[PDB]
Design a protein around this ligand. Sequence first.
Ligand SMILES: CCOP(=O)(COc1ccc(C[C@H](NC(=O)O[C@H]2CO[C@H]3OCC[C@H]32)[C@H](O)CN(CC(CC)CC)S(=O)(=O)c2ccc3ncsc3c2)cc1)OCC
Lengths: 99, 99
Amino acid sequence: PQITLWKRPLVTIKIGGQLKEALLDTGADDTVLEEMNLPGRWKPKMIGGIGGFIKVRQYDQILIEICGHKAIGTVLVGPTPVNIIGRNLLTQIGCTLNF
Amino acid sequence: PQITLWKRPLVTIKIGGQLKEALLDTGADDTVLEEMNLPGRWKPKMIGGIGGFIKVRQYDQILIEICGHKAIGTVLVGPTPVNIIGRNLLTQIGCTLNF
Ligand SMILES: CCOP(=O)(COc1ccc(C[C@H](NC(=O)O[C@H]2CO[C@H]3OCC[C@H]32)[C@H](O)CN(CC(CC)CC)S(=O)(=O)c2ccc3ncsc3c2)cc1)OCC
């Protein structure tokens, strides 16, 4: 579809067998999701933005479905205030900016 | 144009007569630029991101040209890790997400 930017671009995603709301975020290199107890191994990581860094758990080869579009890649889990879909997955669903 | 997301969506902007590079950021409500001298009045504001809140200077009704497209609106100035163009100006230049 086409998403205007008057409001936050929030969509439904499916991950680890759960549905959630997440921001389609062209300023996010990586995908960062709210605390959730995903199975499997993970690597510690720190990601930075406005205000500083947070500590997150990096899980690899995670399947996420975004508005029916499937994607698989790296997902970071940590105390983010919002579920964020970053470019690593946005590219995979064919998402572009257009003006 | 149509901008893909394999790399960061960086563009040249012109503000207060100066050229700079900035990130088109659909996850940003507001536009935040690194410390710089802008003419006119400003008021202190706080904004929050992934790592907490920072103090910024709020400039209203500022002219800014984004990849050839003119906007006039609110620009925050402060210790952001990178210059970001948020939805308040993305809307003005007619930017949408498409997949
Ligand atoms: C409301 C909940 O609480 P809250 O008020 C704000 O919550 C939010 C927290 C984060 C966002 C998303 C964030 N937007 C943001 O900073 O926007 C500011 C400006 O406009 C306002 O609108 C929303 C907030 C205000 C960017 O889109 C993405 N970021 C990178 C950019 C940093 C400038 C480029 C470096 S990233 O997230 O840091 C990030 C993501 C993946 C990644 N992979 C490797 S690095 C790395 C870094 C949106 C809302 O904060 C109090 C705790």
